[PDB]
């Protein structure tokens, strides 16, 4: 529809804010980000 | 000029084709076999005894 | 085994089903004229253009009903 | 006068076409069929 | 697009243009072929084929 | 049953008044004044003229035969004459076919006794027809 | 170098067959190059007489082709199947008999789905030949 | 001035049209043609009998059998095939002669 | 368009020349007067 | 008027009533084909393409051709 | 198997050669929208958005020469086959789709993921993306199916009605001389009315179906066009 | 129904492919 | 049935038959004839275009190990569902 | 036991069922024109535009009926 | 005892029943376009936008019919 | 007596009856989008939220249709 402008480096939220199937995969669970498809979709 | 001559010849050719198609050309594979071909095989091997 | 059966009266059944296709055709025509009246009440000066469009709608709906009726009469004579 | 054709019009009315300004208008108010 | 051309006012004027002359000839053929079929296919001496029950298209397509 | 008759009469009267042929209107007025029938008078005049023109037709036939036989007709042959002759040929063919059908008094040729279609004649639904 | 890619490389003179070509163009232009001959996507012209001439001609030649090339196959099949199952058997009949058979086929065509069904369904008790007549 | 449609000859314009104007469409069309001739270019004898004839298959002369007979006769004569070979018959020539004398 | 000269003018072409020729004003006046008379008679 | 779906074109008036009223009609200058010209029947006096060839004659010609087409085989049947 | 046959356009090809040896203006087009994609001025597209005009015009001419003239009795629609129409629509649709895909711009497909960030990505947005990707192919299939079915149904109905009219006209016209003549005249008038109505309906439907056939393709093209604003 | 058939689909489609690849350029020019 | 028969091409002229084996072999002979000459090295894109895809497809056919039976492509009768032979 | 039975008349029944689809199509078309009238009496200046859309709607809606009708023919001629 | 019957002609009934589903699709499309015509007469300036959404609905409403249509073939050719 | 009859062609009828369920899903989607068009004209400033809600409703209706298709396919195969 309309033109798409890529976000700036400062406009991209941090990875820790993203949520997985059950909950955020923060520290001690970072390596589970690779396996969680929903977390990757949200990211 | 070029297109006029080309279309004149094309018109004559199409006229001949139309007459032949709709008044002379028989339909293939007739039930009685009095008109049209029944089909035949092509590209059959020749002079290749080792093939069989 | 290889049994085979032909039934005669079945063409009465299918024909009847096709007649049901005229239920929504009937209705539909109804609906058009319904709306037409309201339109002629809302804009009474447009009593002819609206009539023409209603006739067009009836003609198309009647064509559909006629498509169905062809089957209904054809199965009844098969 | 002869029976020959003129500038083709495509069956269009030049008084209401999208390029009507390209067709000159005469005294009677009828836009020409040609440039 | 049906924009214009010669249009006969009535039957008698179809002979005022060669194209409409051909048209009225064709219309004569079209409408006159039906009476001919009435006479030919409703004739007294027309007889159904005695062997009409030997074969029919209905058994062939079935 | 009466309104329809009045409407038809009125329509025909309007159409009769509409025509702008001086001779037709004059004849209609004269016959209306005298109370006679114009159409029947026209028919009688036509038949009288044709009765008096029979030998004119014969003379014209012989003159036309001489014109054709002498070759003068083909000397001035044009495309219009070709069109007329094609019309003439078509009428001749159709008349020949109709004559054959009437002569044998049957649309189709009659069936011979040795033909296998005789069964069809025997199994007629209505022998009267 | 062998053949030119440009249409400007003429193969004939400008005056070659000028007369016949001009007659052909006169035939084309007289009715078509007119203001009222405005076509719809080049397929439907505006001149009435083009319809009046071309619809009958198209129907005529299509009908001739159908009658003499397409339906003839069905007619011949009916004749062969109903009168021996072989062409020689049909040729054993006379022209009049073949005429009768072909006209009955025409009757069947005109009835189609609305004619009587006794033309192909043998009523019980009928004395005419059945399907196993030639078998 | 130069224009492709007015100055080039028809084959040249055809190549230009389908190479610099509609190349993808030409590619897809060629793809579809190859597919059709790879998977939709065969018809069995039974299929021909069911649907291959305008008025129906004329069993009373069986043109398919005649066509195949001509095909096989041509192949045998041209390729010098010995149809009496044991592989075709499944038996030795002497056994074939014995069978001929028997029947 | 000399090659068309032999074809002449058909009835429709003659009508168009008559209505849109130098006598166009007279034809327009006559036609409009006749139509007005017929409309008055109809009413 | 109409003949089936074919409608006769009508020229739009270009003169105003004031200018039109000042026009003097002189039918003596008109061609013999168009005298007493009627928009509802402009071709009443138009000449026939072929003298003596009526529309009914052509219609009948077509009817006869149809009869020939349907009846020729009844008189001159041919074998398969 | 190689079948040699010919199309039913040879006379029309002859007429085209005769009547188009000289130039003529075209002012009426069945699908005019292929020529006017942009309606707001100062908008322009870097994509070749007018590439479809030539194919559109040729397709309209071809389909019109076949479908419109098929109303004449015994005229044959030579291409009337389901899979052949599938091939035609496949060519056009997939060619344009591959033109957009060869562009190698993945952001062009961002709009396939329907919805906003509020909607759950896996259970809502991704299933909508699946459905939309399915819907593109379904649009292709529906286009070709709709073109095939209209012709088939219309001509079947015409054939059946013509057969009925022939039957009653030939085998029941004698009632004009009988005492039940009024019934036959009523039926005959009804048949004439039905004849005219069917022919008008088919004439309108053929053109409308060509319009929609071209509109589907142009809609495919328009779904992926992006317009820049002149400054 | 031949419209639903495939036993000679390739030869049948050759008509469309010839129209597209050979006749369209002529109509174009 | 009869109405359905009206939707067939009306200008069928000739039908030719050819076995897949025969014309495939003839095509291979043509390809070998044109790709044989020394002035077309095997590493040229033209030669690989001619040969590699065909080799790959034939290899895929040879490697095939299917648990089901694929009926012969060119049987005399392929209309009977209950007879793959 | 194991019997391969082939009934012939069933193709009528199915055919009739397909015609029932038209009951919707017809009705749907009517609805369009209904609203069309209510839309022309609410903003007549757009009548022509509205008409066009209606025709588009009719052509899309009718399309569906055809599908059903096709099936009927397929079963009625088989 | 155990008797196994294989009726061949029953797929016609299932095909017709599947085709019946197209009535709802046709009715839905008619409703969409009727509402579109009403809406455009109320907010003409946004007509174009509305049209797009309408088409979207058609794209999301015709697809369902295809599935039904699909089943028909899967039973009509089997 | 006792008869254990197994008819092989009854799953087509069940599949068609299940497919009929889509006539409601299609009509529901049509109603959703018709109301969406009516609402956007009423309050165009909220087009995105209305579009999102309509998409949600379509997803739910499509889930129902998926359940119906699951039953249809299960009967068709099993
Ligand atoms: C199998 C073999 C069998 C063989 C059997 C034997 C064969 C015969 C052998 C000889 C026998 C002895 C001789 C007997 C001769 C009798 C005839 C005779 O002399 O005639 C002269 C006589 C006039 O003589 P006249 O009175 O001295 O005349 C004085 C002037 O000369 C007057 O001059 P004119 O200027 O008036 O000239 C014109 C005049 C003279 O024209 C003629 O001479 C005509 C031709 C004469 C011969 C006719 C023979 C008829 C025999 C039966 C039919 C055979 C086919 C005839 C084909 C004719 C084609 C034109 O025209 C007419 O006569 C017109 C008649 C037709 C009138 C039409 C009006 C219809 C109105 C309907 C309205 C309905 C409204 C209902 C509303 C209801 C509301 C609730 O005319 C007639 O008798 C006319 C008879 C016409 C009968 C037609 C019947 C057709 C079949 C029924 C109709 C079916 C279709 C339509 C149905 C529509 C639904 C309702
Ligand atoms: C400065 C020199 C002055 C000399 C003055 C001389 C004056 C006196 C006259 C001289 C004598 C006459 C000269 C010829 C006149 C020709 C007619 C004419 O005037 O035309 C107008 C025009 C006059 O020239 P121009 O206007 O001055 O200049 C033309 C422009 O420069 C460029 O034109 P363009 O590019 O715009 O268009 C050319 C062409 C487009 O270009 C081409 O078509 C050329 C390429 C075509 C290739 C087709 C074959 C491909 C096969 C596949 C590949 C095979 C590869 C094999 C490899 C090796 C294998 C070992 O356009 C067309 O196709 C449309 C026109 C078609 C004409 C109609 C043809 C049929 C008429 C039938 C009438 C009779 C009916 C039957 C009557 C029966 C009665 C009972 O001529 C042309 O347009 C040329 C047409 C050429 C067509 C060739 C078609 C060949 C088809 C048969 C092939 C047979 C192969 C057999 C193989 C067997 C193996 C076993
Ligand atoms: C000397 C010529 C060059 C020699 C070779 C040179 C070196 C190699 C060149 C490149 C080779 C490519 C190899 C394959 C690459 C990948 C594609 C693929 O999968 O291919 C499958 C297969 C090749 O098989 P393969 O993979 O090599 O392995 C064999 C397998 O065992 C087979 O397994 P299968 O199951 O796939 O087998 C089924 C069947 C499957 O076969 C097919 O599907 C055949 C499809 C043919 C496609 C043609 C493409 C061009 C179309 C142009 C537009 C036409 C529009 C429609 C016109 C209709 C009316 C004519 O395969 C065959 O039997 C292959 C036979 C191929 C014969 C090609 C003959 C072309 C004739 C063109 C006629 C044009 C007439 C225009 C007249 C106009 C006049 C104005 O088919 C093709 O590759 C077809 C395209 C071949 C193009 C060759 C080069 C251009 C044409 C040169 C000859 C021109 C003759 C003109 C005669 C004019 C008479 C008037
Ligand atoms: C074994 C028996 C024989 C058969 C062998 C066959 C071998 C097959 C090999 C295997 C092939 C496998 C694949 C087959 C796939 C087929 C698919 C198919 O048919 O699709 C439908 C599809 C239908 O297309 P369409 O829409 O009908 O349009 C194509 C038309 O051709 C019309 O389209 P268009 O109008 O757009 O075309 C352009 C047209 C533009 O318009 C024109 O140029 C007008 C003329 C049109 C001609 C073409 C139409 C033909 C009409 C019917 C036949 C006419 C009468 C023939 C009389 C025969 C009498 C026995 O220009 C031309 O046609 C250029 C050629 C002009 C020739 C002019 C010759 C003049 C000679 C003058 C001599 C004067 C001598 C004087 C001496 C004086 C001495 C004192 O067909 C095609 O697309 C073409 C398929 C061709 C595939 C290639 C086949 C291989 C080549 C075979 C050549 C055989 C030559 C030897 C025969 C000898 C007599 C027995
Ligand atoms: C792109 C461009 C467009 C233009 C063009 O090029 C491509 O398009 C090309 C497409 C061409 C046509 C394609 C197809 C045909 C049919 C053919 O018809 C054969 C008929 C004969 C076939 O007989 C077999 O002949 C074989 C010979 O080896 C034998 O082996 C085999 O045994 C024998 O059966 C004769 O049939 C007999 O008929 C009789 C009853 O009537 C009976 O006797 C009997 O029924 C039957 O024998 C006549 C020629 C024509 C019109 C072609 C003309 C030229 C083109 C227009 C080219 C043209 C140049
Ligand atoms: C833009 C809109 C165009 C609308 C055009 C409207 C045309 C109106 C025609 C009125 C009736 C014409 C009757 C013709 C009779 C011919 C003789 C005959 O027997 O025919 C009977 C035939 C068939 O009649 P039938 O079915 O009763 O035949 C009975 C025959 N038996 C019993 C053996 C079966 O009539 C027709 O088929 C006529 C249908 C015409 C429908 C309109 C077709 C329009 C599309 C083609 C346009 C072509 C223009 C080409 C111009 C050049 C292009 C470059
Ligand atoms: C009565 C029954 C009725 C059934 C009806 C069924 C529907 C029929 C519909 C027919 C009409 C519609 C057809 C639309 C088009 C369909 C297209 C399609 O699916 O075709 C696929 C088919 C697949 O081809 P294939 O079938 O040969 O696949 C080979 C795969 N093996 C070897 C494992 C068997 O495509 C073709 O037929 C064309 C192939 C040649 C052209 C492409 C070559 C390049 C390939 C690139 C990748 C691989 C090589 C490496 C890269 C390149 C290196 C140089
Ligand atoms: C390139 C050939 C090298 C070997 C020598 C071969 C000579 C053979 C004898 C030829 C005698 C007749 C020649 C007639 C004049 C030919 C003129 C010519 O080539 O015109 C091409 C002209 C096309 O013209 P345009 O495309 O418009 O463009 C032309 C200008 N750019 O083509 C034609 O019209 C066809 C003319 C064909 C003539 C004959 C050609 C024969 C070629 C044979 C080569 C093979 C070797 C033969 C050896 C013969 C030994 C006895």
Author numbering:
A (entry chain k): 20 to 62
B (entry chain n): 105 to 156
C (entry chain O1), N (entry chain P1), O (entry chain Q1), P (entry chain R1): 41 to 118
D (entry chain n): 18 to 52
E (entry chain r): 1 to 62
F (entry chain m): 16 to 144
G (entry chain f): 2 to 136
H (entry chain i): 2 to 104
What do the authors say?
Mitochondrial ATP synthase consists of the soluble F1 and membrane-bound Fo subcomplexes and occurs in dimers that assemble into oligomers to induce the formation of inner-membrane folds, called cristae. Dissociation of ATP synthase dimers into monomers results in the loss of native cristae architecture and impairs mitochondrial function. Here, we report cryo-EM structures of the intact ATP synthase dimer from Trypanosoma brucei in ten different rotational states. Although overall dimer architecture varies among eukaryotes, we find that subunit-g together with subunit-e form an ancestral oligomerization motif, which is shared between the trypanosomal and mammalian lineages.
Finally, particles with both monomers in rotational state 1 were selected, and the consensus structure of the dimer was refined to 3.2 Å resolution. Unlike the wide-angle architecture of dimers found in animals and fungi, the T. brucei ATP synthase displays an angle of 60° between the two F1/c-ring subcomplexes. Despite sharing a set of conserved Fo subunits, the T. brucei ATP synthase dimer displays a markedly different dimer architecture compared to previously determined structures. Second, unlike mammalian and fungal ATP synthase, in which the peripheral stalks extend in the plane defined by the two rotary axes, in our structure the monomers are rotated such that the peripheral stalks are offset laterally on the opposite sides of the plane. Due to the rotated monomers, this architecture is associated with a specific dimerization interface, where two subunit-g copies interact homotypically on the C2 symmetry axis. Both copies of H1-2g extend horizontally along the matrix side of the membrane, clamping against each other. Thus, the ATP synthase dimer is assembled via the subunit-e/g module.
